[PDB]
Amino acid sequence: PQEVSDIKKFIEICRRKDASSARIKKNPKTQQIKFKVRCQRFLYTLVLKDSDKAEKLKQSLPPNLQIKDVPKRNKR
Amino acid sequence: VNLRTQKRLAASVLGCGEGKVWLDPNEVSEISNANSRQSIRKLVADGLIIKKPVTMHSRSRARELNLARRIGRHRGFGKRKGTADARMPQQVLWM
Amino acid sequence: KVTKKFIINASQPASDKIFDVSAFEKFLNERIKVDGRVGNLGDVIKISQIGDGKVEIIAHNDLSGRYLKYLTKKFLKKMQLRDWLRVVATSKGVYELKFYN
Amino acid sequence: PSHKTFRIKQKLAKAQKQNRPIPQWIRLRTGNTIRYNAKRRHWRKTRLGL
RNA sequence: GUGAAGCCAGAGGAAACUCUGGUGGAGGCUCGCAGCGGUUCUGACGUGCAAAUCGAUCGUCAAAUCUGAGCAUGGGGGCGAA
RNA sequence: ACUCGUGCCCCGUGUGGCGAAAGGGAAGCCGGUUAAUAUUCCGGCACCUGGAUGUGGGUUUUGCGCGGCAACGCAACUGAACGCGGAGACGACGGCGGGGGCCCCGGGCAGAGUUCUCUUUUCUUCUUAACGGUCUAUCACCCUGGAAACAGUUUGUCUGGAGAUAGGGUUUAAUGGCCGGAAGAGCCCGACACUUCUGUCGGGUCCGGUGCGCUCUCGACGUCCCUUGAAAAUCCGCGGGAGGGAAUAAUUCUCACGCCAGGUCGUACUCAUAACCGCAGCAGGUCCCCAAGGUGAACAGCCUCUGGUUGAUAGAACAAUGUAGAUAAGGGAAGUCGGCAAAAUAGAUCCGUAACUUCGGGAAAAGGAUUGGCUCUAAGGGUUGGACAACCAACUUAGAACUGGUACGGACAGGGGGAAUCUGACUGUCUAAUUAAAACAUAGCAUU
RNA sequence: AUGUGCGAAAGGGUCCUGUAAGCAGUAGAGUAGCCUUGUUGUUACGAUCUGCUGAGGGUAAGCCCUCCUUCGCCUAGAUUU
Ligand SMILES: [Mg+2]
Ligand SMILES: [Mg+2]
Ligand SMILES: [Mg+2]
Ligand SMILES: [Mg+2]
Ligand SMILES: [Mg+2]
Ligand SMILES: [Mg+2]
Ligand SMILES: [Mg+2]
Ligand SMILES: [Mg+2]
Ligand SMILES: [Mg+2]
Ligand SMILES: [Mg+2]
Ligand SMILES: [Mg+2]
Ligand SMILES: [Mg+2]
Ligand SMILES: [Mg+2]
Ligand SMILES: [Mg+2]
Ligand SMILES: [Mg+2]
Ligand SMILES: [Mg+2]
Ligand SMILES: [Mg+2]
Ligand SMILES: [Mg+2]
Ligand SMILES: [Mg+2]
Ligand SMILES: [Mg+2]
Ligand SMILES: [Mg+2]
Ligand SMILES: [Mg+2]
Ligand SMILES: [Mg+2]
Numbered sequence: 001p002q003e004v005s006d007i008k009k010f011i012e013i014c015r016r017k018d019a020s021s022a023r024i025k026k027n028p029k030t031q032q033i034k035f036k037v038r039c040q041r042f043l044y045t046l047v048l049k050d051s052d053k054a055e056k057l058k059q060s061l062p063p064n065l066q067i068k069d070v071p072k073r074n075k076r
Numbered sequence: 077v078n079l080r081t082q083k084r085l086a087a088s089v090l091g092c093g094e095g096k097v098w099l100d101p102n103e104v105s106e107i108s109n110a111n112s113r114q115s116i117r118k119l120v121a122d123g124l125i126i127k128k129p130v131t132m133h134s135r136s137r138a139r140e141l142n143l144a145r146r147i148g149r150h151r152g153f154g155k156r157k158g159t160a161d162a163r164m165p166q167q168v169l170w171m
Numbered sequence: 172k173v174t175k176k177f178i179i180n181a182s183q184p185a186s187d188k189i190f191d192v193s194a195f196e197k198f199l200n201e202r203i204k205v206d207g208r209v210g211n212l213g214d215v216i217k218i219s220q221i222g223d224g225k226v227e228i229i230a231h232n233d234l235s236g237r238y239l240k241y242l243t244k245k246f247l248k249k250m251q252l253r254d255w256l257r258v259v260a261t262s263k264g265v266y267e268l269k270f271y272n
Numbered sequence: 273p274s275h276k277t278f279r280i281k282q283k284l285a286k287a288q289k290q291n292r293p294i295p296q297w298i299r300l301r302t303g304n305t306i307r308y309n310a311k312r313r314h315w316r317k318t319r320l321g322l
Numbered sequence: 323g324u325g326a327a328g329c330c331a332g333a334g335g336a337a338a339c340u341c342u343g344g345u346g347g348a349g350g351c352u353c354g355c356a357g358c359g360g361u362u363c364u365g366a367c368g369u370g371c372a373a374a375u376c377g378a379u380c381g382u383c384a385a386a387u388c389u390g391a392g393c394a395u396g397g398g399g400g401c402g403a404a
Numbered sequence: 405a406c407u408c409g410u411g412c413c414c415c416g417u418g419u420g421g422c423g424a425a426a427g428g429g430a431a432g433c434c435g436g437u438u439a440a441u442a443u444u445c446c447g448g449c450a451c452c453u454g455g456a457u458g459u460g461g462g463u464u465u466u467g468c469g470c471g472g473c474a475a476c477g478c479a480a481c482u483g484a485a486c487g488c489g490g491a492g493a494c495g496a497c498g499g500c501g502g503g504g505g506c507c508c509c510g511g512g513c514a515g516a517g518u519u520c521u522c523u524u525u526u527c528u529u530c531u532u533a534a535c536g537g538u539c540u541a542u543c544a545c546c547c548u549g550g551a552a553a554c555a556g557u558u559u560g561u562c563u564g565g566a567g568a569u570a571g572g573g574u575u576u577a578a579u580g581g582c583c584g585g586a587a588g589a590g591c592c593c594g595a596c597a598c599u600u601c602u603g604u605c606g607g608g609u610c611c612g613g614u615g616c617g618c619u620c621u622c623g624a625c626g627u628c629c630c631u632u633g634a635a636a637a638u639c640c641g642c643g644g645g646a647g648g649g650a651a652u653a654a655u656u657c658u659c660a661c662g663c664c665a666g667g668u669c670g671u672a673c674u675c676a677u678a679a680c681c682g683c684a685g686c687a688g689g690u691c692c693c694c695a696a697g698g699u700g701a702a703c704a705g706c707c708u709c710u711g712g713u714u715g716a717u718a719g720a721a722c723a724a725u726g727u728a729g730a731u732a733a734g735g736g737a738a739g740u741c742g743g744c745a746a747a748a749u750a751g752a753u754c755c756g757u758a759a760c761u762u763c764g765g766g767a768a769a770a771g772g773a774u775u776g777g778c779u780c781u782a783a784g785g786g787u788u789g790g791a792c793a794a795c796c797a798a799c800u801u802a803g804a805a806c807u808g809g810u811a812c813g814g815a816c817a818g819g820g821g822g823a824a825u826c827u828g829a830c831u832g833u834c835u836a837a838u839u840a841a842a843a844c845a846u847a848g849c850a851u852u
Numbered sequence: 853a854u855g856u857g858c859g860a861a862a863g864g865g866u867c868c869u870g871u872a873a874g875c876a877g878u879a880g881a882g883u884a885g886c887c888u889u890g891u892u893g894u895u896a897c898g899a900u901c902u903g904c905u906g907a908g909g910g911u912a913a914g915c916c917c918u919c920c921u922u923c924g925c926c927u928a929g930a931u932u933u
């Protein structure tokens with residue numbers, strides 16, 4: 001697993017051909033939003049502290065790759 | 077009615093020893109049909125199988141003794157079995 | 172001064188007329204300890220009731236909700252309702268009495 | 273032991289397969305004289321030499 | 323537990339080297355648990371739990387200590403702190 | 405080097421196999437799952453080796469990066485033969501320091517136990533993997549500078565004009581902090597469905613302290629040796645400089661990302677008062693790992709927690725003789741071949757300690773006193789202010805009063821001692837299953 | 853097998869031990885935490901001591917007494933002459 005520092009590198013990674021899926025993990029207790037993208041070798045995580053940038057990044061992400069929202073208590 | 081298998085499965089499911097597994101005396105026939113870990117979990121959720129609490133073991137007397145020795149109550153010559161150097165090494169004191 | 176808020180809710184047994192809220196309140200008066208001494212409420216802890224089968228706890232020290240639960244269990248044992256009533260917590264600072272038998 | 277060679281494992285397999293009672297329909301054949309498995313082996317009675 | 327060299331400080335004296343507090347942590351040293359062994363009861367048992375065990379009491383316990391696996395030496399041969 | 409395998413050109417001192425499931429060694433962690441397997445299955449998240457060729461990046465175009473005084477740094481940043489070096493790769497022991505885990509203490513949260521009386525109480529939970537990023541972490545090394553009125557410094561040592569103290573840096577070393585993994589997991593509570601099919605949904609999952617503590621690991625020191633405590637496979641660095649490298653195009657790249665593959669055999673279970681060997685379900689024997697609380701010097705004995713058992717043919721009675729465990733008035737070895745057996749002594753603290761001696765010992769010689777409980781007092785540290793005050797933290801020692809059964813290492817645990825003789829110097833070894841000795845060995849001495 | 857019966861309790865006696873639990877002090881070496889300038893200032897811990905208390909506990913299992921303490925039991929069942 002690898003942390004991505006900035007939005008530009010995160011979106012550039014999301015544009016990759018091997019990018020399989022992405023998911024948003026919302027931690028309300030910390031007021032944190034994590035964007036996770038699954039590539040071939042590594043899972044890349046970008047951390048944001050506010051919802052405005054999260055929404056703008058979600059709408060600016062490539063539309064081919066699928067996005068999920070990490071439901072609470074994911075089933076086996 | 078043999079419930080050794082049920083006791084073993086319940087111990088595995090609950091993550092305790094077989095000596096902490098409680099099986100309902102009045103539901104022996106129902107428990108004997110479990111035979112599977114899914115059914116053991118179902119019986120645990122229904123309350124027919126219960127993990128008994130651990131046996132009490134307190135340190136209150138030890139803590140009381142420690143505080144009494146802090147104020148110097150149980151440390152006379154009749155309470156010492158090791159030598160002075162065994163109780164408090166001169167090398168550690170010098171260091 | 173910091174203020175901490177606790178609520179003890181005996182609404183169900185109070186309505187069923189088996190729990191004496193005034194007796195419980197006087198029990199806190201005569202049992203809660205401050206600085207290791209009883210009867211030293213000294214306006215740092217105020218334990219008035221709020222009517223709807225609930226007792227309200229203002230503390231200006233590190234008074235603990237478990238001490239409170241311990242005192243509630245002691246009162247239940249004293250008045251012999253342990254076999255039917257139990258003390259539960261579902262959110263921060265609130266302990267209520269529930270029937271279980 | 274848990275550590276086994278293939279040869280040892282194969283011989284244990286053969287011994288396990290030979291450890292059985294005789295078929296019932298054998299005793300119904302004409303001229304049959306076999307009453308029971310005379311070469312039966314048990315892990316607690318007779319030790320097999322590898 | 324004892325406390326070998328080396329080291330610090332202080333006392334004497336003239337010298338040289340005497341002494342006294344400490345520090346240090348040597349030794350096929352020592353008490354003693356496990357392990358290893360097997361002294362005495364000439365105890366138990368003695369058609370036994372056992373073709374050598376059991377109990378108490380004992381020896382040793384930081385190194386000629388205890389021990390696994392692999393390997394070598396084969397019968398007038400081997401191996402032997404004998 | 406050719407359409408095509410077969411044409412040549414260089415180097416050469418070597419030129420086998422087997423042999424370790426505890427030696428060396430490429431790489432996997434967590435959660436879940438079965439009646440029985442799981443570091444192998446499932447989910448998530450990784451890594452290594454080998455092979456291929458891409459995209460980006462870097463370097464260059466008569467050439468193969470840049471920075472720093474330096475120690476060295478940075479994402480790469482050509483490099484044949486031939487050679488040099490490193491790693492693999494190493495003893496035992498001692499005290500000290502760092503880290504992980506465990507133990508302990510305080511507060512808080514949730515649950516449980518007790519509650520005639522008392523107890524802000526007793527107990528349990530409160531977790532964070534591999535793999536990575538980032539910042540640090542002793543020793544060492546570099547730069548400035550030039551030390552006696554020598555200084556720095558460890559528990560111990562030691563270090564310095566071959567350059568110390570000091571000031572500033574570089575660097576090996578995470579089982580350290582934070583972040584990703586990762587809360588979505590696990591766990592704990594709480595509340596609503598139900599013949600089953602389906603469970604569903606809420607919340608919470610924290611902060612500090614302490615240490616001659618236990619265990620593992622790492623580090624710097626040190627001691628001992630007429631003892632100096634493997635090898636090889638494999639991997640890396642360098643010296644050298646052979647070949648090769650399109651001003652509008654690839655680029656002999658240890659950089660980032662990406663593609664493909666990883667065969668075979670083992671994997672259940674026991675490992676022992678019933679799964680092995682002793683004819684057996686035999687009180688014997690059989691190599692390891694982990695290792696809680698109290699007392700206490702202590703993996704001593706004794707009690708307890710987790711976990712595991714309650715399995716060893718039973719019932720009744722209580723004769724002799726037994727086996728095992730004890731007690732006995734007065735005498736105290738008169739017993740007996742013989743004090744055999746048993747008893748007596750025993751911890752700790754403080755006094756005191758002869759003959760002899762190889763000066764090291766003898767020695768715990770011999771002997772004597774004290775020891776409980778309670779209430780106090782003093783001393784032994786760190787931090788901050790402004791010589792005192794405040795805050796923080798364990799234990800170790802000493803002194804006093806009071807008190808009772810004149811008792812207190814209250815069980816357990818735990819030397820009897822002395823005066824001599826023979827003998828072997830000592831430590832050590834042997835007749836497995838009747839002899840452990842004065843026998844053997846030993847260092848020393850001597851001879852060949 | 854109707855008894856001066858048998859048994860189980862209880863009570864009394866005898867005997868052994870040695871003063872129970874609990875409550876209270878002005879008794880307790882002292883200490884602390886708030887105040888009234890103390891003479892008991894009120895409290896809070898405190899081995900122990902004193903009173904209730906020769907108390908409490910045990911007592912036949914091979915101790916004694918109880919025709920009028922209490923609660924039960926009974927003229928069987930089977931075998932042989
Ligand atoms: Mg010690
Ligand atoms: Mg020795
Ligand atoms: Mg032995
Ligand atoms: Mg004998
Ligand atoms: Mg006999
Ligand atoms: Mg023996
Ligand atoms: Mg004996
Ligand atoms: Mg081989
Ligand atoms: Mg190996
Ligand atoms: Mg896998
Ligand atoms: Mg998987
Ligand atoms: Mg590769
Ligand atoms: Mg390029
Ligand atoms: Mg080696
Ligand atoms: Mg401990
Ligand atoms: Mg705690
Ligand atoms: Mg973490
Ligand atoms: Mg310097
Ligand atoms: Mg995280
Ligand atoms: Mg959550
Ligand atoms: Mg170890
Ligand atoms: Mg440690
Ligand atoms: Mg297995």
Ligand SMILES: [Mg+2]
Nearest residue numbers: 316680681684
């Ligand atoms: Mg056998």
Ligand SMILES: [Mg+2]
Nearest residue numbers: 676677688689
């Ligand atoms: Mg055995």
Ligand SMILES: [Mg+2]
Nearest residue numbers: 697698699700
């Ligand atoms: Mg202990």
Ligand SMILES: [Mg+2]
Nearest residue numbers: 145698699700
């Ligand atoms: Mg202790």
Ligand SMILES: [Mg+2]
Nearest residue numbers: 702703704705
């Ligand atoms: Mg112990």
Ligand SMILES: [Mg+2]
Nearest residue numbers: 094711712713
């Ligand atoms: Mg078991």
Ligand SMILES: [Mg+2]
Nearest residue numbers: 371687716717
């Ligand atoms: Mg038997």
Ligand SMILES: [Mg+2]
Nearest residue numbers: 727728729730
């Ligand atoms: Mg006897």
Ligand SMILES: [Mg+2]
Nearest residue numbers: 732733734735
């Ligand atoms: Mg006598």
Ligand SMILES: [Mg+2]
Nearest residue numbers: 732733734735
């Ligand atoms: Mg006598």
Ligand SMILES: [Mg+2]
Nearest residue numbers: 735736737748
């Ligand atoms: Mg005498």
Ligand SMILES: [Mg+2]
Nearest residue numbers: 737738739740
């Ligand atoms: Mg005589």
Ligand SMILES: [Mg+2]
Nearest residue numbers: 737738739740
């Ligand atoms: Mg005689």
Ligand SMILES: [Mg+2]
Nearest residue numbers: 362744745746
């Ligand atoms: Mg004797």
Ligand SMILES: [Mg+2]
Nearest residue numbers: 746747748749
């Ligand atoms: Mg004795």
Ligand SMILES: [Mg+2]
Nearest residue numbers: 764765766767
């Ligand atoms: Mg001496």
